[PDB]
Amino acid sequence: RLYWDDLKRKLSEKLDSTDFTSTIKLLNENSYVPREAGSQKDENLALYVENQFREFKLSKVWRDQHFVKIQVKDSAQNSVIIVDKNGRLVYLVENPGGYVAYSKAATVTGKLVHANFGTKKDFEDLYTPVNGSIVIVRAGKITFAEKVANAESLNAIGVLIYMDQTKFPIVNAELSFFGHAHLGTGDPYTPGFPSTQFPPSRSSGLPNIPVQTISRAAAEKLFGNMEGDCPSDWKTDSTCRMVTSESKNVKLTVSNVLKEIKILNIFGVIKGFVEPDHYVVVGAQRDAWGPGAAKSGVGTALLLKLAQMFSDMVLKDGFQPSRSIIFASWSAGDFGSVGATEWLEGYLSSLHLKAFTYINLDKAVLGTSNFKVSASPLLYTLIEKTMQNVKHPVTGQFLYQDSNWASKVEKLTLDNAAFPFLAYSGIPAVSFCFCEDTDYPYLGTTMDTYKELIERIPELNKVARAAAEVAGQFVIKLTHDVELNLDYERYNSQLLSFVRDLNQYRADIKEMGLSLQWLYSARGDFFRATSRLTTDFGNAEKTDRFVMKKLNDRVMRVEYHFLSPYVSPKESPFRHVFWGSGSHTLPALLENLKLRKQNNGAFNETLFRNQLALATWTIQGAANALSGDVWDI
Amino acid sequence: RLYWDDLKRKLSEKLDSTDFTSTIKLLNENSYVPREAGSQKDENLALYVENQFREFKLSKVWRDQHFVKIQVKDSAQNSVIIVDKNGRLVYLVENPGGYVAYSKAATVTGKLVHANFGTKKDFEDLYTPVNGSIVIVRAGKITFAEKVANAESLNAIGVLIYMDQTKFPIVNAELSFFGHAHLGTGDPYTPGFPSTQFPPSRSSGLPNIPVQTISRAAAEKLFGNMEGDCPSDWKTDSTCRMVTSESKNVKLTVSNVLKEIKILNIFGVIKGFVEPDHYVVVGAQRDAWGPGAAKSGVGTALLLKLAQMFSDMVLKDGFQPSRSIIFASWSAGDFGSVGATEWLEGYLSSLHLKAFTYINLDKAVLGTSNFKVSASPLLYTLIEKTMQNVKHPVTGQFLYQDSNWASKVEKLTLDNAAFPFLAYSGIPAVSFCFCEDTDYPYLGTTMDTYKELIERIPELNKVARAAAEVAGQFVIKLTHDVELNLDYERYNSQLLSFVRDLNQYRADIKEMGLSLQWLYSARGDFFRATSRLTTDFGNAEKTDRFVMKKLNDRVMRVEYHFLSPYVSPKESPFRHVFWGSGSHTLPALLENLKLRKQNNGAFNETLFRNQLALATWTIQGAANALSGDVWDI
């Protein structure tokens, strides 16, 4: 067993002589260049990664194979067409190079209406009714899946998406791009039974309208046939317009088809010396529509180098992780973390007893200016201590520069592979990156190349190196300390913050005959439960692996006990009342209640009483799950 | 620490000098005599039990209080009336002394039709259509809740239930009786929010028709006005008839009302010396409609004596249970294990990590001829070894007399408090009793008295003594051995048996384009997972509480991982794919498939493909949950 100081030094010095850019460049070679999930090139890289793991001599390397239905574009072209309502003659504007996976295959003709980013707010602020019209929106702010849903929610009949030059200062205006519009993760077409025969989807999260990505040039050509200046508030090109002329409307034809593919998740593992049946999981997306250097290459490179380093530290330098470290190369990430989700779904309710943390490595390097982090609050302390002794690659200062960084942390979103881990599986998760206030413009394009990457970021090797150090320090701390570096006390602030918000309606809870007393008591009981647990840790003999096991297991279950037990994972997979999606999340409870100031019928008093109940029960249950022995109350 | 041989002797000799009949008699005194749930007498007994626990000096004794809505009969009498369709004049036949909790409060008039036991089969074998008619059925075979559901399922408008003299050779034909018809357990009116305001119930399992219990005399008076002899196949009184005369039909008026009551679950605990945060739970129903000597008294008596004995063994004789023993006195058992279920529901998904076994003590003594057992397969080995060294109270031979007893074991039913533990909470459970091939006739009547009990069973003290020895040996084995006496290998036979059944349709699975290959692989993987676990146990150092903790925790999770993760506990609480209720259970999958030999539209091919899928996923998940470390595959 080594000292944390030595492990820190060892990791750092191994990192010093590590060549990241070579690997990123290597992954950008023609053997791997265009690696859409399931393709032979994806399969090539999968084989290469797998071989590398074998050369690193990890305890065991294996395959997690899955068959899934994705959507690819048909031999028939998707098309964007302008129609003259006079005589109904059509003019072809574009056959897009790209497409949007999970779009309804359909042909729709209507008026075209701009809706900015297609955010929920953008739609309400519209002075043009979207109903029965095709909508065009800029990429960014929110996922394609959300834009489609918001629009579909207002009865739009189709969606176009372009990259405006203000948000995406790309010289080539003919660039086409890719994404998906499945409002979830995993395979949307997952019949619980094999079939020839065709069953409907139900609560799939799939679009019922066609959605399609277009080049900025094609959008500006559409603007050429539209009227109305865009609000300066949108801060967009002067090109932009709002609505088709009276005599014209647009026709969209999407003919994407379902294809079944064989994806491979490639796994390596360094077994733990004390509790090998518990693991930290480190993963990266291996697939990409185009070259996907930043989208896929960076992550896969870090995955490979981290795996190599840790294998060397165990075999040469005497590092002895208490718990196991699993390295995961995912496929079909581009379709909604499909690879990751399929694997997660094998262990719906059991995984949280083995995996205590997931570290995502996707898009860790996109810029230089900033260091962003999204994570479970359970990892805020680990993250903080890690930023306090990792240096900025350009700047030289420690990453930790703001004592208040934790309150400004944004939550994991659906397009992040870290999301299903936290919100569906109840495993604390963290994603982080070096970046700007600007999205990396080339993501999802054929311009996401190494050359492009090394050009916007000439210090690529140093920056990737800093990204590896944070992930590496995470992984060491997590498998070295006898306690788990999961700060369960953090959820007191979260509950406090939530009740603090809720208490801004102590009046409206009166006019409904409701007391919030049982909820306050749940919050109090959780506080007590954490306090007792901290005391127990302090009074425990750190060398007694039996008592630590027992205390650590309690910590490992905190996250999962915030998954609502009162909703089916099939109907709503994202059960986490803090971080998931649906009417069972604390945020939903607040939004339903904010709709009570308006005397409009949007408020749903009944729903709220149920939400209040389920929240209280969930929180009580978590407090009770943490308290320990049934005679201690 | 003592030797199993000494603990066996100690338990036995303490039992030898234990006076059971005194306690049963004591519970039959006027201070407790009629103790309907929530009543003052129930509350008296609750206080007495609680005091006794305090005198026994258990580690901690506490209260688990709940407010629940039960139904009691109104000041207005329920009535059974015969109507002359000529002139519509009515004749009062009875104002029943008893009632059926959860009956719809309503008045209905129609023809009366006998349907034997009201089993699903009994209805199909009817040559008289039940639709729009009131139905009369004999008690027995199935719960009232099922009879009502089956009848309601065929559009009957009301249900009468009597005790025929063949199944219930009771001299007094005027005897009235009680039960409930809620097709589940727990409080059916559980709004997730407090209210004045009234919300509908939804998937409550509540009757939409009136149901009422009548005396045999009242039934025979009804038969007096009916025609058609009953099938000799029913083996019932010659009195019985099938249908009202042309000119007559029956009117039923039920006016039961909802009352909110305060129930108390009384708990005692003897803390474990090694893992106190894990418990065996031993419970008994304290409430009864009448005197409920057999229904409630026996169980509560055993609960008290067991608690006392084990407290003495810990404090005087040096017994040191590894894990905790909790003694539970439940209330509102008579309404569907309501007390038990309410408590279970506080720990929906967390309880199975603390409670590894529930032993039910209800109706353990009803006769002398037989010893019956129902339980999770996880306890078959414990049960067997226990029968191999417990003697029959009358006979003197060991209870174990049939090497094949396990394949003839009937599953826990809904009226058993052991049921929600296993099927809703995923905690292995066992109920057992000494009994006959005949139901104890006085259950749910005012004749369930000590005097009646001591009369049909003069060896009451000896028989109760044998009942305590099995429960006691269960409890000792379970808290003494370093391994858990949960035989997880047993579920290989279960899966085998199930697939063996399913394989009787390998043809019909072809005509649907389906392979069963992924299901076979799940079964294989579970087999592997258990084999590996047995090996691990063998290779473990029995004195290393850390490794044992880890292996025992894996065993403790087997049961729960058979709860279907794909159904909400609110919509269907009984999620256990082997032992629960609904379309997600393996049995349901078989029944849907047996409906494919008939070319009638009852078969539901789509449903089956989903069932096949969910089953496969559930089983795979359980196998994967058992395999241990993610690098072991």
How far apart, in Å, are the Cα atoms of A191 and each of A103, A385, B341, B605? 19, 45, 33, 13
A203 and A340 part of one domain: no
10 Å Cβ neighbour count for A315? 13
Q: What is the CATH number of the domain that holds B614?
A: 1.20.930.40
Phi/psi for A333 (5° steps) reads -65, -35
Contact of A326 with chain B, judged by CB distance below 8 Å, is answered with yes
Same domain, A327 and A426: yes
Can you spell out the DSSP letters for B280-301? EEEEEE---SS--IIIIIHHHH
Per DSSP bridges, beta strands A275-285 and A179-180 are unpaired
Q: Which of residues 33-72 of B touch A (CB under 8 A)?
A: 59-60, 62
What are the two backbone dihedrals, phi and then psi, of residue A61, each rounded to the nearest 5 degrees?
-125, 145
User: B23: closest CA among B299, B271, B301, B380?
Assistant: B301
Separation CA A216–CA A222 (nearest Å): 10
B196 exposure class (CB count in 10 Å sphere: 0-12, 13-18, 19+): exposed
Calculate helix-pair angle for B40-56, B298-315, nearest 10 degrees: 20
Beta carbons within 8 Å of B485's beta carbon, 6+ residues apart = B379, B381, B382, B477, B478
Q: What's the first-to-final CA gap in chain A, in angstroms?
A: 39
Last-in-domain residue among B254, B276, B303: B254
Whether A345 and chain B come into contact, CB under 8 Å, resolves to yes
Structure tokens at A195: 């079939």
Which residue has tokens 């954490």?
A530
* Separation of CA A37 from chain center: 18
Task: For residue B612, list chain A residues with Cβ-Cβ distance below 8 A.
Answer: 192-194
Q: Give Dmax over CA atoms of chain A in angstroms.
A: 85
For residues A286 and A335, the answer to whether their CB atoms sit within 8 Å is: no
Q: What DSSP assignment string belongs to B315-336? A: HTS----SEEEEEEEESSGGGT
Nearest to B192 among A194, A197, A613 (CB): A613
SS3 state at A344: helix
Tokens of A518: 């049982």
Whether the CB of A279 is below 8 Å from some CB of chain B: the reply is: yes
Q: Can you name the residues that pair with B113 across neighbouring β-strands?
A: B135, B243
| CA–CA dist B24, B296 (Å, integer) | 9
- Range list of H helices, A285-361: 298-315, 338-346
Tell me if residue A194 falls in helix, strand or coil.
Answer: coil
Which of B204, B225, B254 is where one domain is finished? Answer: B254
Handedness of CA A383, A386, A387, A393 (dihedral sign): negative
Kind and range of the H or E run holding B533: helix B517-539
Co-location of B142 and B85 in the same domain: yes
Q: Cα angle vertex A447, ends A446, A448, to 5°?
A: 95
- Spatial distance between the Cα atoms of B223 and B173, rounded to a whole number of angstroms: 14
Site from B65, B281, B629, B632 to mutate, A interface, most A CB atoms within 10 angstroms: B629
Kindly state whether A543 is in contact with chain B, defined as any CB-CB distance less than 8 angstroms. Answer: no
Residue in A closest to B567 by C-alpha: A568
Which of A196, A624, A631 is the closest to B513 by Cβ? A196
Q: Give the span between the Cα atoms of A609 and B191, in whole angstroms.
A: 9
B-interface mutation test, from A59, A310, A630, most B Cβ less than 10 A away? A630
Distance from CA of B410 to the nearest CA of A (A): 29
Whether residues B572 and B613 share a domain: the answer is yes
Identity of the residue in A193, A348, A631 whose CB atom sits nearest the CB atom of B271:
A631
Nearest to B549 among A549, A570, A621 (CB): A549
Judged by a CB distance cut-off of 8 A, whether residue B324 touches chain A is yes
Angle between helices B298-315 and B460-480 (to 10 degrees): 50
- Enter the tokens of residue B537: 């146990």
- Which of A193, A421, A482, A577 to probe the B interface (max B CBs under 10 A)? A193
Question: Domain boundary at A461, A490, A519, which?
Answer: A490
Long-range contacts of B38-44 (CB under 8 A, 24+ apart): B38/B70, B38/B259, B38/B261, B38/B262, B38/B263, B38/B287, B38/B331, B38/B332, B42/B263, B42/B286, B42/B287, B42/B331, B43/B262, B43/B264
- Secondary structure letter of residue B459 according to DSSP: T
Complete edge-to-edge strand list for the sheet that includes strand A429-435: A60-72, A257-270, A323-330, A275-285, A355-360, A429-435, A370-375
Question: Three-state secondary structure along A144-167?
Answer: HHHHHHHHHCCCCCEEEEECCCCC
- Sign, CA dihedral A328-A331-A335-A339, equals negative
Cα dihedral B456, B461, B463, B464 in deg (nearest 10): 110
- Measured between CA atoms, how close is A569 to chain B, in angstroms? 6
- Nearest-neighbour CA in chain B from A527: distance (Å): 18
Put simply, the answer to whether B512 touches A197 (Cβ < 8 Å) is: yes
Structural domains in chain A (count) = 3
- Rounded to the nearest 5 degrees, what angle is found at the Cα of B50, between the Cα atoms of B46 and B51? 120
Q: How many CB atoms lie within 10 A of CB A614?
A: 21
Find residues 123-162 of chain A whose CB sits inside 8 Å of chain B.
none
**Chain A nearest CA to B369, separation (Å):** 39
Residues whose CB falls within 8 Å of the CB of residue A246, separated by 6 or more in sequence, listed in order: A85
Residue B631 has its nearest CB partner, among A60, A192, A545, at A60
Which residues lie below 8 Å from residue B12, measured CB to CB, with a gap of 6+?
Answer: B469
d(CA A186, CA B53): 53
How big is the CA angle at A574 (ends A142 and A372), to the nearest 5 degrees? 45
Nearest-Cα distance to chain B for A627, in Å, is 10
Nearest CB among B60, B197, B566 relative to A570 is that of: B566
State the CATH number of the domain containing residue B394: 3.40.630.10
Least Cα distance to A334 among A32, A34, A37 occurs for A37
Q: Which chain B residues are within 8 Å of A546, Cβ to Cβ?
A: 545-546, 549
Across the interface, do B612 and A275 touch by the CB < 8 Å criterion? no
Give the pair of three-digit tokens for residue B229.
């002899």
Residues A342 and A403 occupy one common structural domain: yes
Show residues of chain A in contact with B518, CB under 8 Å: 194
Do A624 and B565 make contact, defined as CB atoms within 8 angstroms? Answer: no
Q: Enumerate the residues of chain A whose CB falls inside 8 A of the CB of residue B566.
A: 192, 568-570
How was this one solved?
cryo-EM
Residues A610 and B200: beta-carbon distance below 8 Å: no
Asked if B161 and B134 count as a contact pair (C-beta separation under 8 A), the reply is: no
The structure was resolved to a resolution in Å of: 5.5
C-alpha triplet A22, A23, A25: angle, nearest 5°? 65
B24 and B68 assigned to the same domain: yes
- Residue B484 shares a structural domain with residue B339: yes
Chain A residues with CB under 8 Å of B632 CB are 60
Retrieve residue A35's tokens.
């690696």
For the record, the structure tokens of B139 come out as: 């008690």
Q: How many CB atoms lie within 10 A of CB A513?
A: 11
- Whether A172 and A230 share a structural domain: yes
Nearest CA to CA, how far is A272 from chain B (Å)?
10
| Binary contact (A610, B557; C-beta < 8 A) | no
Which residues in chain B have their C atom more than 2.5 Å from the N of the next written residue, marking a break after them?
Answer: 195
Record: contact A621-B271, CB cut-off 8 A: no
Cα(A474)–Cα(A385) distance, integer angstroms = 10
Residues of A in contact with B354 (CB under 8 A): 630
Contact A618, A565 (CB under 8 A): yes
What residues have CB less than 8 Å from A147, skipping those under 6 apart? A117, A118, A119, A137, A159, A161, A181, A211
Q: How near does any CA of chain B get to the CA of A615, in Å?
A: 9
**Single-letter code of the amino acid located at B615:** A
Domain that holds residue A516: 491-632
Nearest-Cα residue of chain A relative to residue B624:
A347
Task: Give one word for A588, left, alpha or beta, with left for phi > 0 and alpha for psi -120 to 50.
Answer: alpha
Which pair of structure tokens corresponds to residue B38? 């929530």
Contact A193 B514 (CB under 8 A): yes
Which of B61, B189, B193 should we substitute to test contact with A (largest number of A Cβ atoms within 10 Å)? B193
The CA distance from A393 to A16, in Å, is 12
- Give the residue from chain B lying closest to A629, CA to CA: B277
Residue A157: give its domain's CATH number.
3.50.30.30
- Minimal C-alpha gap between B486 and chain A (Å): 19
Are A625 and A501 found together in one domain?
yes
* Statement to judge: residues A265 and A402 lie in one domain: yes
Q: Which residue of A has its CA nearest to B280?
A: A630
A565 contacts B348? CB cut-off 8 A: yes
At residue B251, what is the residue type? K
Closest in A350, A549, A631 to B621, CB measured: A350
Closest in A59, A557, A633 to B631, CB measured? A59
In sequence order, the 6+-apart residues with CB closer than 8 A to the CB of A325 are A269, A270, A272, A279, A280, A282, A310, A475, A479
Question: What are B508's two structure tokens?
Answer: 């019909």
The encoded tokens of residue A182 equal 């499945």
**Residue type, position A624, single letter:** N
| Cα–Cα distances in angstroms (integers) from residue B460 to residues A541, B49, B334, B390, in the given order | 52, 21, 23, 17
Whether residue B631 and residue A566 make contact (CB cut-off 8 A), yes or no, is no
Pairs of residues, one from chain A and one from chain B, whose beta carbons lie less than 8 Å apart: 177
Q: Which A-chain residues 203-232 have CB contacts (< 8 A) with chain B? A: none
Pair B182, B277 in one domain: no
A334 within 8 A of A285, measured Cβ to Cβ: yes
> Nearest-CA neighbor of A282 among A472, A548, A410?
A472
Q: Do B629 and A324 touch (CB under 8 A)?
A: yes
Q: How far is CA A498 from CA A81, A492, A502, A508, A578, in A?
A: 49, 10, 6, 16, 9
Q: Which residues, in sequence order, are bridge partners of residue A180?
A: A101
Could you give the 3-state DSSP secondary structure of residue B23?
helix
Say yes or no: B553 contacts chain A, CB-CB below 8 A.
yes
Which A residues, 177 through 196, put their C-beta within 8 Å of a C-beta on chain B?
A: 191-196
Please tell me if residue B565 touches chain A, with a CB cutoff of 8 Å: yes
DSSP state of B391: B
| A513, A569, A624: residue with CB nearest B347 | A624
Residues forming a β-bridge with B88 = none
Number of Cβ within 10 Å of residue B259's Cβ equals 12
Same domain, A247 and A311: no
Q: Cβ of B198 under 8 Å from any chain A Cβ?
A: no
Cβ atoms within 10 Å of A569's Cβ, excluding its own:
19
